[PDB]
């Protein structure tokens, strides 16, 4: 059907439109203007409009008649998510009003904000609504509503209006917003909700203790759709509920909602209903357009949110349960199905039970399959502190949850491991050759028919993404065209070979839905389109630069083919548990590690492969200052029926040890078996359970390897501290006190992380082969400690020792700790001993130990009949993967430089250094002081890094190199600048030894990039010796390597010219003005300093404006270092502080080749805008700009002379830009110099500079009108006036404000005398006057008047089209057009303009210009000046200068920081007094409304409907006529009553006189009166001129009885018939009762008088009926003709 197709097309349109960022706050402004209703229902109505957007409701004032004119603009300022805003509904609703009753509904249109967002420009324009009644919907239309509504986001602008004389004001089907094919259709979504599983405990569990712990939740589903909330039934005490309820969602098709929000709630009787979790159906993702309606399911949707552990206290992460944030734990899953049923709109049973045959259908989507998951933990590095022991728990869904103690021991977690210092900064878990192994078994639906397709399309997209990265690197590197064509042919053949992939056959699979068939059909269509376009492109196209736009479109289409809403597999969540508490999480999608039998590509990207994931703290959007751990893990997921295929993915030998414990005790100096009381001699690890050596047997698939052996060597075998060559030791020191007492040395005055006392620093000695770097130890300052290096903690019972520390001392603290460091360069009888049995045994006996024990362990090896797959058959054993050999590597990181770093000191700079970390190794770069753009120029070498696994597995997945940038501070702790994560270039042999390429990787702090760092790395597999490694880089300091020659950017000699023009807006520094500044420009280690300004207040510009330095700069434009600008204020006692700095990193713009009817102003304005025309008299126009003059792209922002860079000072807070303390005005020209001085230098680029002295300027600000201001009063209007600040002078106009309009017509010139450039900042503000209260600011704009003065485009005065010396268009510039042509010839280096002997030709710019080339086809009226100036001006108009313009300047405000608060049509002329006085100013004073008189006479009435009963008691009518103009309610007049009419006929011969003010140029009238009696100032209305004539039954002693009306718009008055018998209905338009026809119209203002018969009407049951006929003559006279022939 066409309805299903158009729903699919509209949902794909909203699919393409919904692509912006999901910022939960975002500032939006929605304007809704109603203009004019046409043909509203009822008779003698008093209509009114109420518009409801986002809860806010505005209200029009009361108008009259069946064709009301409102022209009222409403504003809606909301702050919400864009996706939530575009699901909101705008509800326009027309009411009738009464004098003694409330409002009655008469029409309603509903339209969502999303579709008016999808319109180009985010704003529908003067479109007509089809009003309909929600309960009287069978009657069709009720009226029409011309509205225009706008949506403005951050940076968005409304589109300009267009001319409306004949296209928009008439006929309404020419501008319908929606066509008639919609036919008020409803769309019904049957969101069936079957059941849910694994809902966590959300009740108190104390009631069941008194009286079952698995089912402590009372769930129900909240379905939010289009603002309506439908709640399902509540299932009491069931964690696996079964609702089985269809939710009958409904939307009328003009207003659709896209985001169905399902939110399971735990119902609480006494408290608020808690949130279980929130998932969404996106209707645009489950619908397409051939196409199909929204279909989904039956498929489980997984919920995510807070951790599942119940706390009676408020949990800190309930914001994750509401769908905000990504969610850190599995909260259950809900089985839903979506079906779309067009029409049939059933209002009964919004909740309907599931029919009993759908419960048989849904059984086949509920079948479970066994899944086996393995995870081999390779390396857990970048740990910030050791703390307690650290454990990793793997869980998919609720399977493998360690805190679910009600189940059996799951063995889904690693052993507790204690972190080891890597020698420089970080910590790592010491796994080495024995990686931990986690295995767990889950049960999910076999949805491989989805996930093979998802994984294969993802592999397609990743291959094509790699190929387009190769292509963009090829075209960026300027590699030769043959290799580029070969690489492009490789790309196209990759597409051809890939997209002949047949998607998996849905027939035969159990869990195939209707949506699965539709997505498979869509994917086959898309893949066939991509394959055939590839076979077209491989033979047709020849150029790759045209085709990358199509190839990126293929990448976009392929990445939209991987969208799978029916992914029922929950994510694998890996939790780091420090101590007993959850710390950090990561979510791996289950399809990324899932194994399929269909091949490699159908398996996941990381299926059986080691991937690097960074854990996050549970409510962080990204990593902040502290990454908790960087974890490399080898995850393989798959079906347990094919778990034998894990053998091909496994590496190493999996190993589980059976264990036994034997205990002994010491009496009389001899160890023996005596005294083993309370714990068994042969027992477990705790000693409570008696065990034997014969109690352990291998399970199925396992066999013994070797014999039982003693295992005491696990202390020595943990990596032997041999992987480092430069180290830093650490020894901790402790003190203790009572609360409130004095400090003293502790019971354990030196400790380590294990929890007991350690050796003093005087006892520490080096290992053999090592020596000390420093002579003595020192205490740590660079942590969260005080001045002496101490942190403080507390002991709380029942714990005896502290577990946390803070930076400051409080009175309740009982302990303290200090770290001591020093750099470094270059017994075992088989038992562990302790003081008690079952105590803390340690490998060496102390004086207090009288007990001992040992381990008796035997190895199990997997059998050959099972392979490594036997680890899944362990249904506790602890599995660990042993690697039989190690591979030695060698990493070199070329940290070259950084740019645009954050300022984190008070002296406006930083001291950045970098921690380079890679696995269990770390090193620190040098500290570069007092800069934000450091050049470390340093190579960081980690020789002999031990990486386990095959070298190919390192090649496919390199471990990440992580750089953390820190601002060094001499006191306090060093602050975090950002973090860059990148992959090294792995090399395994001498073939792949190509040199690495430096790249600008981003430096992410939080969620934003806070600079870029130029860094690369290479990771070389070390051979038999270090001979295969390249040579060491040359040192410049001891153990300080430079970046080598092949990696370093190749530098050339390059000039940088700096046009230091001047400094603007210099804010005070240290409560002193910037009196003697200077400029310092640093680039590439060289600096240049300008001359010192002796007084900034006197001279704001540098005395010599050109600086010059020779710098070595990279040849490649990518590698170009930033340009640093500082401002140094020179003060007393020789002090030179820095008072401002900017970083300019985009220098590609700076590189250049050095060898390269009444006549006034408003008639002109209305002729240019388009609102006896003015162009017929031959006069000129002006150029109306819809934006600012700086925002016009042709004038380059009016910064062609010099750009402007904001200067910043001090430490920046919340990672944004720092405080702006001014602006440096200048520009740069960068060009490569010749290498040797025999070649002459290139010419300088700054020669034609103007004079930098201050100049006095006469500035004329002509402000024309304001457009759509923000309302600042209670009535929705504003009383605007103009407040101009220009340096010191303020001209406010509060006594000449314009009363109560949102579209003011100012028409006022404000002339000032200011000194440029000290007063360059021209601030024009519109302010709302108030009678008693404070004045609000509507808006604000800034014009750089020096940019107007100094630009080459002549923006100081716009050149008009004609040179007139008199009239209203007199030449307002100071200089004649010959002098402007002289000036532009002098600027451009052209020869000066040569005037001929008669002024007909001018030689300029190498061309001949003549008078007859421009003066032809024009009327040369009398105001034209000298013809040589006309021809010079005609030359000047073609030179790209600023024309005579009215720019539209956006009024910005702090109410909404980048949303237009209105617009201000205006222009500014700057007239510098050195060039002479200007001409006469333009009189832009708005024209008065010229008076008009409307006169009618009423001849007769015929076939009027007779009144049914008069007062006298007869079928008898008292016919008489009222008449008025809308707006003029006070000017109502009525005729005499034609008494005793028994035939519907009546003669009046009565005269009406209707004075009204008119604007012929705007084609509308002015009526002025107060809104009410207590109005401060009278208001003005702008409504089109029209006449309401009305016919009435008198009833002199009774009520007035309405009979009919007739409306004649005086510009479009319909042509009357010449007789009452030819007069009939439907010669006037009608759009509701019958299929419409065009009428015949004539203007009464032009055709001044005509006489005839007119039809008048009323309506009943929505259909027009004739109330009668009336004869009249309508005439319009002006003011003087009303006095020439007056009338009564």
Ligand X SMILES: CCCCCC(=O)OC[C@H](COP(=O)(O)OC[C@H](N)C(=O)O)OC(=O)CCCCC
Extract the annotated binding site for Ca(2+): 212, 218, 266, 268, 274, 905, 911, 967, 969, 1273, 1279, 1328, 1330, 1595, 1598, 1601
Residue 1336 touching ligand X (CB under 6 A): yes
CB nearer to ligand X: pick between 270 and 360: 270
Under the binding rule (CB under 6 A), the answer on residue 271 touching ligand X is: yes
Closer to ligand X by Cβ: residue 513 or 1461: 1461
- Taking the least distance from each CB to ligand X, the nearer of 314 and 347 is 314
With contacts defined by CB under 6 A, name the span among 268-276, 288-296, 761-769, 894-902 that binds ligand X: 268-276
**926: nearest Cα among 1018, 1038, 1004, 819:** 1038
State in angstroms the smallest separation of the CB of 199 from ligand X.
12
> What span, in angstroms and rounded, lies between the C-alpha atoms of 635 and 588?
9
1574 binds, among Ca ion, ligand X, none (CB under 5 to 8 A by kind): ligand X
DSSP summary character for residue 643: G
Q: From Ca ion, ligand X, none, which one binds at residue 204 (CB under 5 to 8 Å depending on kind)? A: ligand X
Give me the least distance between CB of 880 and Ca ion, in Å please. Answer: 42
Q: What is the phi/psi pair of residue 1314, to 5°?
A: -125, 165
Tell me the longest C-alpha to C-alpha distance in the chain.
Answer: 143
Choose from Ca ion, ligand X, none: what does 314 bind? Cβ within 5-8 Å by kind.
Answer: ligand X
1551 within 8 A of 1685, measured Cβ to Cβ? no
* 225 φ/ψ angles, rounded to the nearest 5 degrees: -150, 120
Q: Does 1330 bind ligand X (CB under 6 A)?
A: yes
For residue 1494 the two structure tokens come to 């409307």
Measured from the CB atom, is 96 or 1272 closer to ligand X? Answer: 1272
Residue 1536 binding ligand X, by CB under 6 A:
no
Q: Determine, following the binding rule CB under 6 A, whether residue 1332 of this chain makes contact with ligand X.
A: yes
Tell me the site size for ligand X, rule CB under 6 A: 20
Q: Where are the alpha helices (DSSP H) in 643-751?
A: none
- Rounded distance, CA 1058 to CA 372, Å? 67
User: Looking at 356, 1039, 1274, 1417, which residue binds ligand X (CB under 6 A)?
Assistant: 1274
- For position 1273 contacting ligand X by CB under 6 A, the verdict is yes
SS3 525: helix
Name the binder of 1417 from Ca ion, ligand X, none, CB < 5-8 A by kind. none
How far is Cα 638 from Cα 654, in angstroms, rounded to an integer?
Answer: 18
What is the SS3 assignment for 1388-1415? HCCCCCEECCCCCEEEECCEEEEHHHCC
Question: Binding string, 203-232, against ligand X, x = CB under 6 A?
Answer: xx-x--------------------------
270 binds ligand X (CB under 6 A): yes
1601 interacts with, out of Ca ion, ligand X, none, CB within 5 to 8 A per kind: Ca ion
Q: Which is nearer to ligand X, 215 or 900 (CB)?
A: 215
Give least dist CB 1450 to ligand X, A. 20
Which is closer to ligand X, CB of 1155 or CB of 1574?
Answer: 1574
Smaller CB separation from Ca ion, 802 or 1280: 1280
Whole-number minimum distance, CB 619 to ligand X, in Å?
Answer: 16
Q: Is 1117 exposed, middle or buried (0-12, 13-18, 19+ CB in 10 A)?
A: exposed
Binds 1332: which of Ca ion, ligand X, none (CB < 5-8 Å by kind): ligand X
Nearest distance from C-beta of residue 1178 to Ca ion, angstroms? 44
* Residue whose CB is less far from ligand X, 274 or 1593: 274
Q: Which does 668 bind (CB under 5 to 8 A by kind): Ca ion, ligand X, none?
A: none
Site string for ligand X, 1555-1574 (x = CB under 6 A): -------------------x
Binding mask 273-312 for ligand X (x = CB under 6 A): -x-------------------------------------x
Q: Does 1454 participate in binding ligand X (rule CB under 6 A)?
A: no
- Find all residues with CB under 8 Å of 572, minimum gap 6, and list them: 373, 394, 395, 396, 587, 588, 590, 593, 635, 637
Residues 6 or more apart in contact with residue 581 via CB below 8 angstroms: none
Query: Percent helix, strand, coil in the chain (nearest 5)?
Result: 15, 40, 50
CB 663 within 8 A of CB 684: no
CB of 586 to ligand X, least distance (A): 24
Strands 1219-1232 and 1203-1209: antiparallel
Contact between 1355 and 1189 under an 8 Å Cβ cutoff? The reply is yes
| Bridge partners for 1056 per DSSP | 1109, 1230
* Residue 461 token pair: 């997209």
Strands 1008-1021 vs 985-987: parallel, antiparallel or unpaired: parallel
* Shortest Cβ 1274–ligand X spacing (Å): 4
Among Ca ion, ligand X, none, the one that 1507 touches (CB under a kind-dependent 5 to 8 A) is: Ca ion
Residue (1272 or 1369) nearer to Ca ion, CB = 1272
Contact predicate 1033/1041, CB 8 Å: yes
| Least distance (Å) between residue 275 CB and ligand X | 8
- Exactly one of 268, 385, 600, 1213 binds ligand X (CB under 6 A); which one? 268
Contact (Cβ atoms closer than 8 angstroms) between residue 1540 and residue 1516 = yes
Query: Taking a C-beta distance cutoff of 8 angstroms, is the pair 1082, 1124 a contact?
Result: yes
At 1185 the three-state DSSP class reads: coil
Query: Which residue's CB comes closest to ligand X?
Result: 312
Binding partner of 735, given ligand X, Ca ion, none, CB within 5-8 angstroms per partner class: none
Binding-site partner at residue 911 among Ca ion, ligand X, none, CB < 5 to 8 Å by type: Ca ion
Q: Is 1279 in the site for ligand X (CB under 6 A)?
A: no
Find the shortest distance in angstroms from Cβ 1662 to Ca ion.
Answer: 24
The item of Ca ion, ligand X, none sharing an interface with residue 270, based on CB under 5 to 8 Å by kind, is: ligand X
* Least gap, CB of 1279 to ligand X (angstroms): 9
Burial of 994 (0-12, 13-18, 19+ CB in 10 A): exposed
Look at residue 1518 and give the partner it binds from ligand X, Ca ion, none, a contact being a CB closer than 5 to 8 Å depending on partner kind: Ca ion
DSSP characters for 160-173? PP---TTTTSS-SG
Strand ranges inside 812-850, DSSP E? 815-825, 832-834
The partner in contact with residue 1510, picked from Ca ion, ligand X, none with C-beta cut-offs of 5 to 8 angstroms by kind, is: Ca ion
**Could you tell me the smallest distance in angstroms from the CB atom of residue 911 to Ca ion?**
4
**For helices 544-561 and 514-540, what crossing angle results, to 10°?**
170
Q: Would you say 66 and 39 are in contact if contact means Cβ atoms under 8 Å apart?
A: yes
CB atoms within 10 A of CB 1522: 17
Please, are residues 1554 and 1492 in contact by the beta-carbon 8 Å criterion? no
State the CB neighbour count (10 A cutoff) for residue 146.
Answer: 22
Distance of alpha carbon 1207 from alpha carbon 1127, whole angstroms: 9
Chain residues that interact with Ca ion, rule: CB under 5 A: 202-203, 218, 266, 268, 271-272, 274, 904-905, 911, 967, 969, 975, 1272-1273, 1279, 1328, 1330, 1333-1334, 1336, 1507, 1510, 1518, 1593, 1595, 1601
Q: Which two tokens stand for residue 1358?
A: 């716009």
1528 contacts 1552 by C-beta, under 8 angstroms: no
Please identify which residue in 4, 315, 563, 1571 interacts with ligand X, judged by CB under 6 A.
Answer: 315
Angle among Cα 1058, 1061, 1062 to the nearest 5 degrees reads 125
Q: Is residue 1272 within the footprint of ligand X (CB under 6 A)?
A: yes
Q: Under the criterion CB under 6 A, does residue 202 sit at the interface with ligand X? A: yes
CB of 1451 to ligand X, least distance (A): 16
Residues between 1574 and 1633 that touch ligand X (CB under 6 A)? 1574
By the criterion CB under 6 A, which residues form the site for ligand X?
Answer: 202-204, 206, 268, 270-271, 274, 312, 314-315, 1272-1274, 1330-1333, 1336, 1574
């Amino acid at each position: 059907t066409v309805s299903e197709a158009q729903l699919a097309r509209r949902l794909t349109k909203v699919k393409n439109s919904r692509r912006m960022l999901s910022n939960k706050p975002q500032d939006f402004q929605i304007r809704v203007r109603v203009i004019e209703g046409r043909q509203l229902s009822g008779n003698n109505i008093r209509p009114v409009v109420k518009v409801h957007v986002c809860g806010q409701t505005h209200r029009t004032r009361i108008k009259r008649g069946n064709n009301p004119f409102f022209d009222e603009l409403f504003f809606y300022n909301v702050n919400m998510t864009p996706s939530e805003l575009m699901d909101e509904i705008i509800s326009i609703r027309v009411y009738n009003s009464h004098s003694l009753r409330a409002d009655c509904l008469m029409g309603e249109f509903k339209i969502d904000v999303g579709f008016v967002y999808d319109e180009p420009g985010h704003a529908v324009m003067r479109k007509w609504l089809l009003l309909n009644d929600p309960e009287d919907t069978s009657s069709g239309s009720k009226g029409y509503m011309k509205v225009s509504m706008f949506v403005l986001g951050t940076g968005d602008e409304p589109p300009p209006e267009r001319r409306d004389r004949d296209n928009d004001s008439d006929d309404v089907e020419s501008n319908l917003l929606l066509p008639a094919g919609i036919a008020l259709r409803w769309v019904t979504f049957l969101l069936k909700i079957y059941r849910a599983e694994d809902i966590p405990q959300m009740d108190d569990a104390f009631s069941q203790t008194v009286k079952d712990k698995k089912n402590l939740v009372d769930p129900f589903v909240e379905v939010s759709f289009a603002g309506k909330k439908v709640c399902t039934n509540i299932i009491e005490k069931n964690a696996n509920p079964e609702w089985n309820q269809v939710v009958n969602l409904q939307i009328k098709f003009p207003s659709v909602c896209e985001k169905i929000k399902l939110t399971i709630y735990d119902w609480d009787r006494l408290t608020k209903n808690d949130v279980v979790g929130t998932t969404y159906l996106h209707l645009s993702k489950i619908a397409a357009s051939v196409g199909f309606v929204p279909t989904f399911g039956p498929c489980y949707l997984n919920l995510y949110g807070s951790p599942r552990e119940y706390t009676g206290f408020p949990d800190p992460y309930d914001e994750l349960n509401t769908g905000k944030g990504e969610g850190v734990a599995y909260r259950g899953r809900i089985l839903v199905e979506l079906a779309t049923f067009l029409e049939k709109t059933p209002p009964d049973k919004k909740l309907e039970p599931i029919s009993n045959d759908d419960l048989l259908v849904v059984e086949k989507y509920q079948r479970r399959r066994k899944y086996s998951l393995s995870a081999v933990f390779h390396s857990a590095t970048m740990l910030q502190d050791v703390g307690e022991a650290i454990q990793f728990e793997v869980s998919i869904g609720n399977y493998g949850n360690r805190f679910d103690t009600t189940c059996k021991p799951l063995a889904s977690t690693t052993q507790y491991s204690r972190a080891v210092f890597d020698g420089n900064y970080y910590y790592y878990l010491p796994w080495a050759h024995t990686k931990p192994v986690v295995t767990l078994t889950s049960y999910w639906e076999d949805i491989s028919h989805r996930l093979d397709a998802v994984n294969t399309l993802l592999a397609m997209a990743e291959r094509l993404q790699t190929n387009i990265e190769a292509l963009k690197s090829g075209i960026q590197g300027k590699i030769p065209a043959n290799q580029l064509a070969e690489l492009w042919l490789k790309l196209i053949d990759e597409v051809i070979e890939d997209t002949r992939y047949t998607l998996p056959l849905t027939e035969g699979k159990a869990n195939v839905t209707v949506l699965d068939t539709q997505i498979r059909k869509l994917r086959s269509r898309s893949l066939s389109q991509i394959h055939e376009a590839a076979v077209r492109m491989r033979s047709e196209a020849t150029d790759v630069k045209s085709t990358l736009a199509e190839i990126e479109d293929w990448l976009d289409k392929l990445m939209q083919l991987t969208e799978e809403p029916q992914n029922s597999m929950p994510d694998i969540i890996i939790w780091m548990i420090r101590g007993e508490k959850r710390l950090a999480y990561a979510r791996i999608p289950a399809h990324q590690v899932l194994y399929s039998t269909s091949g490699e590509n159908a398996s996941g990207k990381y299926c059986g492969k080691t991937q690097t994931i960074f854990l996050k703290y549970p409510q962080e959007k990204n990593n902040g200052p502290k990454v908790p751990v960087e974890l490399r893990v080898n995850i393989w997921l798959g079906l347990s029926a094919v778990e034998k295929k894990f053998n091909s993915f496994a590496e190493g030998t999996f190993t589980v040890f059976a264990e036994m414990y034997e205990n002994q005790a010491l009496m009389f100096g001899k160890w023996g078996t005596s005294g083993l009381v309370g714990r068994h001699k042969f027992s477990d690890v705790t000693g409570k359970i008696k065990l034997k050596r014969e109690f352990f047997l291998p399970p199925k698939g396992w066999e013994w390897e070797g014999e039982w052996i003693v295992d005491p060597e696990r202390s020595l075998l943990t990596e032997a501290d041999a992987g480092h060559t430069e180290f830093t030791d650490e020894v901790y020191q402790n003190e203790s006190r009572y609360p409130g007492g004095d400090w003293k040395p502790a019971e354990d005055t030196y400790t380590d992380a294990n929890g007991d006392k350690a050796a003093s620093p005087s006892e520490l000695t080096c290992p053999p082969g090592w020596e000390w770097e420093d002579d003595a130890w020192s205490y740590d300052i660079n942590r969260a400690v005080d001045e002496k290096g101490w942190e403080y903690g507390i002991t709380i019972p029942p714990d005896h020792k502290p577990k946390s520390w803070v930076a400051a001392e409080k009175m309740y603290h009982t302990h303290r700790r200090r770290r001591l460091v020093r750099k470094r360069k270059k017994d075992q009888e088989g038992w562990e001993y302790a003081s008690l049995i079952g105590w803390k045994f340690h490998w060496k006996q102390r004086s207090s130990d009288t007990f001992r024990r040992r381990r008796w362990r035997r190895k199990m090896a997997p059998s050959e009949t099972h392979g490594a797959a036997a680890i899944f058959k362990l249904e506790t054993p602890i599995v660990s993967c042993n690697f039989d050999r190690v591979y030695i590597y060698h990493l070199r990181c070329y940290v070259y430089q950084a740019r645009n770093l954050l300022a984190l000191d008070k002296d406006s700079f930083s001291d950045p250094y970098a921690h380079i970390c890679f696995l269990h190794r770390s090193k620190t770069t040098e500290i570069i002081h007092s800069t934000l753009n450091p050049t470390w120029d340093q190579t960081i070498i980690f020789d002999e890094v031990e990486i386990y696994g095959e070298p190919q597995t390192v090649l496919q997945n390199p471990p990440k190199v992580i750089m953390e940038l820190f601002d060094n501070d001499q006191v306090g702790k060093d602050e975090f600048l950002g973090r860059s994560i990148f992959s090294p270039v792995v090399k395994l042999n001498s073939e792949m030894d190509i040199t690495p390429k430096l790249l600008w990787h981003p430096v992410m702090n939080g969620d934003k990039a806070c600079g870029d760092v130029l860094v690369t790395a290479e990771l070389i597999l070390r051979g038999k010796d270090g001979s295969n490694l390249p040579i060491l880089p040359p040192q410049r300091a001891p153990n300080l390597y430079m970046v080598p020659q092949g990696i370093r950017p190749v530098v050339q000699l390059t000039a940088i010219e700096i046009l230091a023009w001047g400094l603007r807006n210099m804010k005070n520094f240290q409560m002193a003005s910037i009196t003697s500044p200077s400029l310092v420009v640093e680039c590439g280690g060289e600096r240049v300093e300008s001359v010192v300004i002796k007084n900034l207040k006197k001279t704001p510009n540098f005395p010599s404006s050109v600086l010059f330095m020779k710098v070595f700069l990279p040849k490649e434009e990518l590698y170009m270092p930033p340009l640093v600008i500082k401002v140094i204020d020179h003060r007393q006692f020789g002090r030179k502080p820095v008072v401002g700095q900017c970083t300019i990193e985009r220098l590609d713009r700076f590189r250049c080749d050095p060898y390269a009817e009444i006549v006034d102003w408003w008639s002109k304005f209305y002729a240019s805008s388009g609102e006896g025309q003015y162009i017929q008299k031959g006069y000129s126009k002006l150029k109306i700009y819809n934006c600012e003059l700086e925002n016009v792209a042709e004038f380059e922002g009016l910064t062609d002379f010099s750009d402007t860079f904001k200067l910043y000072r001090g430490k920046s807070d919340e990672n944004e830009d720092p405080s702006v303390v001014g602006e440096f005005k200048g520009s740069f020209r960068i060009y490569p110099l010749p290498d040797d001085p025999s070649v002459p230098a290139p010419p300088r680029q700054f020669r034609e500079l103007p004079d930098s002295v201050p100049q006095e300027c006469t500035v004329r600000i002509y402000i024309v009108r304001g457009l759509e201001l923000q309302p600042q009063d209670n009535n929705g209007l504003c009383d605007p006036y103009i407040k101009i600040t220009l340096g010191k002078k303020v001209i406010e106009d509060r006594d000449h404000y314009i009363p109560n309009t949102l579209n003011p017509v100012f028409g006022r010139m404000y002339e000032l005398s200011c000194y440029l450039p000290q007063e360059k900042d021209l601030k024009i503000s519109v302010y709302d006057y108030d009678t008693f209260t404070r004045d609000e600011k509507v808006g604000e704009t800034i014009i750089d008047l020096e940019n107007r003065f100094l630009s080459r485009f002549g923006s100081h005065c716009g050149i008009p089209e004609e040179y007139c010396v008199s009239g209203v268009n007199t030449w307002r510039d100071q200089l004649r057009p010959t002098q402007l042509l002289q000036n532009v010839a002098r600027f451009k280096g052209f020869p000066q303009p040569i005037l001929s002997e008669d002024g007909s030709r001018i030689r300029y710019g190498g061309r001949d210009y003549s008078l007859d080339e421009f003066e032809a086809n024009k009327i040369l009226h009398q105001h034209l000046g000298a013809p040589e100036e006309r021809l010079a001006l005609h030359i000047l108009r073609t030179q790209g200068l600023v024309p005579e313009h009215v720019e539209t300047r956006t009024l910005h405000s702090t109410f909404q920081p980048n949303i237009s608060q209105g617009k201000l049509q205006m222009w500014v002329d700057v007239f510098p007094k050195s060039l002479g006085p200007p001409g006469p100013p333009f009189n832009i004073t708005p024209r008065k409304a010229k008076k008009y008189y409307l006169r009618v006479i009423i001849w007769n009435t015929k076939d009027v409907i007779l009144d049914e009963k008069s007062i006298t008691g007869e079928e008898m009518s008292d016919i008489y006529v009222k008449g008025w103009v809308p707006g003029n309610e006070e000017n109502k007049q009525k005729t005499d009553v034609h008494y005793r009419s028994l035939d519907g006929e009546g003669n009046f011969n009565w005269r009406f006189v209707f004075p009204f003010d008119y604007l012929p140029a705007e084609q509308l009238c002015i009526v002025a009166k107060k809104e009410h009696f207590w109005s401060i100032d009278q208001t003005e209305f702008r409504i089109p001129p029209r006449l309401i004539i009305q016919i009435w039954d008198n009833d002199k002693f009774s009520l007035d009885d309405y009979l009919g009306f007739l409306e004649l718009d005086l510009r479009h008055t319909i042509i009357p018939a010449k007789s009452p018998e030819k007069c009939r209905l439907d010669m006037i338009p009608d759009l509701k009762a019958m299929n419409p026809l065009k009428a015949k119209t004539a203007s009464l203002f032009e055709q001044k008088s005509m006489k005839g018969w007119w039809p008048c009407y009323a309506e009943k049951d929505g259909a027009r009926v004739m109330a009668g006929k009336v004869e009249m003559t309508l005439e319009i006279l002006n003011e003087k003709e009303a006095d020439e022939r007056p009338a009564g």
